[PDB]
C-alpha cells in the first residue's frame, strides 16, 4: 500500500487533500492539533467517502510541539512501517483582524496585483491601505506563531519522518506554500540575497533570516529594518519554507520535495473568500504528491504550473 500523512487536515484545504488522496486508494493519516476536531473530521470524511474504515486513520499532530511530532513518527513506524507521502499543509496567517474582516481580502487582492507587476519588471510594491472599516494587526506573538507553524513545522516534521520516507519506493514531500513567499515581495535586501543564493543555502542561514525578522517585529523595527509593510510574517515564513524545500531536495535526492501555491481559495484563513473552492485548491498539492519518479524536485510551483506538470 501507499501511506500519506497530511497536517492541518481537520478543515480547509487539508481536509480535501485527504479526500482526494483517499479516492486514489492511498491510505491517509488525517492529522489535527485538536483531537476532538480531528476525530470528527475523520468521521465526516469517512462518511462522505463511503469507504472502509481502514482507508482513513486519525492521529493528533501539532506541528509546533516537538513531542507531538515525535509521537506521530513512532505511530507510523508501529502501524505501517514506512511513509510514502508527507503533505505539510498546516498554516496560520500571523494576522488578527479588527473591524471589518473583509479588509483581509483587500490586502490579498492588492498583493496579487503587486506580485503581477513585480513579475512583469516593476521595481517596487505599491503602497496600500484598505477601503473598508477594518485593519490587519500584526504583532510579535502572531508572527512567532506564524514562523513556528509555517516554517519550523514543515522542517521539523520533514526531519522526523526521513527514516520512514526513506523506506518508500517513491518518497514525496509537498509543502503548501504561497505565491506571497516570492522574494520579489520580501523587501529585505539581505534576506532576499540569502534566500536567493541557492548554492550557499543551508538550514542555518534560513533560520538566521527568520530569527532576525522575529527580533525586529518584537522590537518594532519592521519598517526601519526593511521587512514587508503587511503580511510580514506570512511572507517571511513562506519564503523560508520555499528555501527549505530547496535545501531538503538537495539533501534527499531520491525524494521529490516541492512547494506549491494552491491558489486563492475559500477557507477559514480567507474568511471564505477567493475564487477557488477547497476541492479546486487541493488539486495542486495532490498533483505534486503523485508526481512520477524523475519529476522536478526542489521547486516552487504556482497553481497553473503545478497542474500542467503532467
Ligand atoms: N486558502 C488560501 O487561499 C490559501 C492560499 C495560499 C496558501 N494557503 C495555505 O494553505 C494551507 C491550508 O490553509 P487553509 O486555507 O486550508 O486554511 P484553514 O482552513 O485555516 O486550515 C488551516 C489548518 O491548519 C491547521 N493548523 C494551524 N496551526 C496548526 C498547528 N500548530 N498544528 C497543526 N495544524 C495546525 C488548522 O487547525 P485548527 O483547526 O486547529 O486551527 C487547520 O486544520 C496553509 O498553509 C495556508 O498558508 C491557503
Ligand atoms: C495568510 C495568507 C495571505 C495566506 C493564505 C491566503 C493566500 C491567498 C495566500 C497566503 O499566503
UniProtKB/Swiss-Prot annotation:
InterPro entries in the cross-refs: NAD(P)-bd_dom_sf, SDR_fam
Residue numbers binding NADP(+): 6-29
Subcellular location: Cytoplasm
Name of this chain's protein: (-)-isopiperitenone reductase
Cell membrane as UniProt keyword: no
Binding locations of substrate: 178
Pathway: Secondary metabolite biosynthesis; terpenoid biosynthesis
Gene3D superfamilies cross-referenced by the UniProt entry: NAD(P)-binding Rossmann-like Domain
Keyword field: Cytoplasm, NADP, Oxidoreductase
GO MF term (any one): NADPH binding
Entry keyword annotation includes NADP: yes
EC numbers: 1.3.1.82
Family: Belongs to the short-chain dehydrogenases/reductases (SDR) family.
A single cellular component GO annotation: cytoplasm
Entry's pH dependence statement: Optimum pH is 5.5.
TM region(s), chain numbering: none
Amino acid at each position: 500500500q501507499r501511506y500519506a500523512l497530511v497536517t492541518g487536515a481537520n478543515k480547509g484545504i487539508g481536509f480535501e487533500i485527504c479526500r482526494q488522496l483517499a479516492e486514489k486508494g492511498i491510505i491517509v493519516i488525517l492529522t489535527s492539533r485538536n483531537e476532538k476536531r480531528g476525530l470528527e473530521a475523520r468521521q465526516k470524511l469517512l462518511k462522505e467517502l463511503n469507504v472502509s474504515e481502514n482507508r482513513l486513520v486519525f492521529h493528533q499532530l501539532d506541528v509546533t510541539d516537538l513531542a507531538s511530532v515525535a509521537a506521530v513518527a513512532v505511530f507510523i513506524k508501529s502501524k505501517f512501517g514506512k511513509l510514502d507521502i508527507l503533505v505539510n499543509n498546516a498554516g496560520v496567517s500571523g494576522v488578527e483582524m479588527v473591524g471589518d474582516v473583509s479588509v483581509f481580502n483587500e490586502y490579498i487582492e492588492a498583493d496579487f496585483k503587486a506580485l503581477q507587476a513585480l513579475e512583469a519588471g516593476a521595481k517596487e510594491e505599491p503602497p496600500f491601505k484598505p477601503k473598508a472599516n477594518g485593519e490587519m494587526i500584526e504583532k510579535f506573538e502572531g508572527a512567532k506563531d506564524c514562523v513556528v507553524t509555517n516554517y519550523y513545522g514543515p522542517k521539523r516534521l520533514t526531519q522526523a519522518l526521513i527514516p520512514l520516507l526513506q523506506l518508500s519506493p517513491s518518497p514525496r514531500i509537498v509543502n503548501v506554500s504561497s505565491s506571497f513567499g516570492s522574494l520579489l515581495l520580501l523587501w529585505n535586501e539581505w534576506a532576499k540575497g540569502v534566500l536567493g543564493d541557492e548554492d550557499r543555502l543551508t538550514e542555518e542561514r534560513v533560520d538566521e533570516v527568520v530569527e532576525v525578522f522575529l527580533k525586529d517585529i518584537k522590537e518594532g523595527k519592521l519598517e526601519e529594518s526593511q521587512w514587508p509593510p503587511h503580511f510580514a510574517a506570512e511572507r517571511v515564513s513562506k519564503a523560508a519554507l520555499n528555501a527549505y524545500t530547496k535545501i531538503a531536495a538537495k539533501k534527499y535526492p531520491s525524494f521529490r520535495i516541492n512547494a506549491i501555491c494552491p491558489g486563492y481559495a475559500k477557507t477559514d484563513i480567507t474568511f471564505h473568500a477567493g475564487p477557488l473552492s477547497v476541492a479546486e485548491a487541493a488539486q495542486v498539492p495532490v498533483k505534486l504528491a503523485l508526481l512520477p519518479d524523475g519529476g522536478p524536485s526542489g521547486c516552487f510551483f504556482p497553481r497553473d504550473k503545478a497542474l500542467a506538470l503532467y
